[PDB]
């Protein structure tokens, strides 16, 4: 009876690294979990592995004579904890859609049964910055019940956050897609912390959990692990257990509520990241005083 | 002999200020410009017409309907200098494709002669990160003959840089789309210059320019303007008139030759930006 889930966010903010030492501490607590990455930009399973780089089926697939010649155990890989792994790959460059490659890779998934397998949670990793259609159908066909937003307390974050919101709403009137709350990759950033819950506020949903900035996050790292197996007596450690707990138990999923561009910029404005326009200078060279 | 350019790159790294400032400064130079928007996430027309955002391609047709029932006059809009500003507007959250949203705009405006009015140039800004077969479309479709990629020395704009240059690759045998440069968003990093002209080299193409960082930047930028257009004066703006001045002349336009992850880790490595990686401690606990 697996919970299928997945963690969206833009890039450039620890997503993978939030999503990877989560689905660590889950099987410390006696889980089984898959995880497949659907980011054609950040190693999603690097830290479960200590890999520098796992294959991922759409290159086993651009030079191993295409999809069904492939064997299940040269894409699905197990580490810690014995949580299976699994990278679906990008596009091609230039001619690819992440979209259609995810879908490929889930496909494969199913009609090679890696499902029908005895496990407790399954967690997509995906790009949530631009949700074109093609980040969404992960979504669109039900692969992916329940979908916890990463984010920060940055602009672009939470523009995605909001993005990433119309994209679930978009198919709530069809399926069991919700939006089950929001995670803050910490940044050291001032009142981040209530950003984000007047965020999920208005979403209508909750921030599920606080992840601190910790200096142990990227020892754990350099040396390709996550810290709840670098350190399990780490501070760190406890912080995501926190958050493995919390997904474990959660029952709010919800159909989100979009916000406006300005009544995010209010919510910027309001907890002091970006200030207020002094409107009377817009358009004023230094020649005009 | 309109030229047809566009500037690609990563987000984050100020390319859309970037392509605004070089567009100001040609626009001084008397050129006619027209910027056309292809970035979801960021606006690339702000700066030259002193607004918050502007009325996109789609949303503008949301309204009415649809692009045919669609004025001209409502989606290009004139400011700086004569300059002529068009915004595609992103995809619809879960289900629009930046592929067909570019097309759609191409295809208006052609249709409305918005092209062959008088024009020098003209600059689609689009996002360059992942290089999907829909953020390539100007390149699959022959809209975008001379690009520039707006990178800065660091992992992901640099490797963004690169997947750029492999769309460009994979059109080679059917149009005239061709790699003009790279453009360096200067990130006060040390050796940032010379990065930057290592990976033009290995890409077989020419690091076009190195902006700096510089605060008169922002300063424009809060005003919702173009340093150019807010200090004339300023050093900065000497620095946008040097790339526009380099780009109306450039002539060293090719066909890239994209390197691998390897190959572009050694480069960070070398220039210092990452660091050698201690085998022996791998997955090692540390106790
Ligand atoms: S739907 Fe998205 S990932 Fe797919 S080709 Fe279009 S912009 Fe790219």
Same mark, same amino acid.
């Given at each position: 009876?697996?919970?299928?889930? $997945?963690?969206?966010?833009?890039?450039?903010?620890?997503?993978?690294?939030?999503?990877? !030492?989560?689905? *660590? $501490?889950?099987?410390?607590? &006696?889980?089984?979990?898959? /995880? @497949?990455?659907?980011?054609?930009?950040?190693?999603?399973t690097?830290?479960? =592995?200590?890999?520098?780089?796992?294959?991922?089926?759409?290159?086993? $697939?651009?030079?191993?004579?295409? @999809?069904?010649?492939?064997?299940?155990?040269?894409?699905?890989?197990?580490?810690?904890? &014995? @949580?299976?792994?699994?990278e679906?790959?990008?596009?091609?460059?230039?001619?690819?859609?992440?979209?259609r490659? @995810?879908?490929?890779? +889930?496909?494969?998934?199913?009609?090679? &049964?890696?499902?029908?397998?005895? #496990?407790?949670?399954?967690?997509?990793?995906?790009?949530?910055?631009?949700?074109?259609? &093609?980040?969404?159908?992960?979504?669109?066909? !039900?692969?992916?019940?329940?979908?916890? +937003?990463?984010?920060? %307390?940055?602009?672009?974050?939470?523009? *995605?956050?909001?993005? /990433?919101?119309?994209?679930?709403?978009?198919?709530?009137?069809? %399926?069991?897609?919700?939006?089950?709350? #929001? +995670?803050? !990759?910490?940044?050291?950033?001032?009142?981040?912390?209530?950003?984000? +819950? $007047? #965020?999920?506020?208005? =979403?209508?949903?909750?921030?599920?959990?606080?992840?601190?900035?910790? !200096?142990?996050?990227?020892? *754990?790292?350099?040396?390709?692990?996550?810290?709840?197996?670098?350190?399990?007596?780490?501070?760190?450690?406890?912080?995501?257990?926190?958050?493995?707990?919390?997904?474990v138990?959660?029952? =709010?999923?919800?159909?989100?509520?979009?916000?406006?561009?300005?009544?995010?910029?209010? #919510?910027?404005?309001?907890?002091?990241?970006?200030?207020?326009?002094?409107?009377? /200078?817009?358009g004023?060279?230094?020649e005009?005083?």
């Amino acid at each position: 009876a697996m919970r299928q889930c $997945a963690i969206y966010g833009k890039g450039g903010i620890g997503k993978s690294t939030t999503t990877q !030492n989560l689905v *660590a $501490a889950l099987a410390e607590m &006696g889980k089984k979990v898959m /995880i @497949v990455g659907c980011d054609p930009k950040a190693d999603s399973t690097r830290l479960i =592995l200590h890999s520098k780089a796992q294959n991922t089926i759409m290159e086993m $697939a651009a030079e191993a004579g295409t @999809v069904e010649d492939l064997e299940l155990e040269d894409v699905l890989k197990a580490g810690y904890g &014995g @949580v299976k792994c699994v990278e679906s790959g990008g596009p091609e460059p230039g001619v690819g859609c992440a979209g259609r490659g @995810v879908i490929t890779a +889930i496909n494969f998934l199913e009609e090679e &049964g890696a499902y029908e397998d005895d #496990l407790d949670f399954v967690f997509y990793d995906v790009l949530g910055d631009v949700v074109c259609g &093609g980040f969404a159908m992960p979504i669109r066909e !039900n692969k992916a019940q329940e979908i916890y +937003i990463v984010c920060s %307390g940055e602009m672009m974050a939470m523009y *995605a956050a909001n993005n /990433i919101s119309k994209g679930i709403v978009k198919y709530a009137n069809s %399926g069991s897609v919700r939006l089950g709350g #929001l +995670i803050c !990759n910490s940044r050291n950033t001032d009142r981040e912390d209530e950003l984000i +819950i $007047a #965020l999920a506020n208005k =979403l209508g949903t909750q921030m599920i959990h606080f992840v601190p900035r910790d !200096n142990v996050v990227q020892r *754990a790292e350099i040396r390709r692990m996550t810290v709840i197996e670098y350190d399990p007596k780490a501070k760190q450690a406890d912080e995501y257990r926190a958050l493995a707990r919390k997904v474990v138990d959660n029952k =709010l999923l919800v159909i989100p509520n979009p916000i406006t561009m300005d009544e995010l910029e209010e #919510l910027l404005m309001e907890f002091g990241i970006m200030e207020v326009e002094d409107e009377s /200078i817009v358009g004023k060279t230094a020649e005009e005083v």
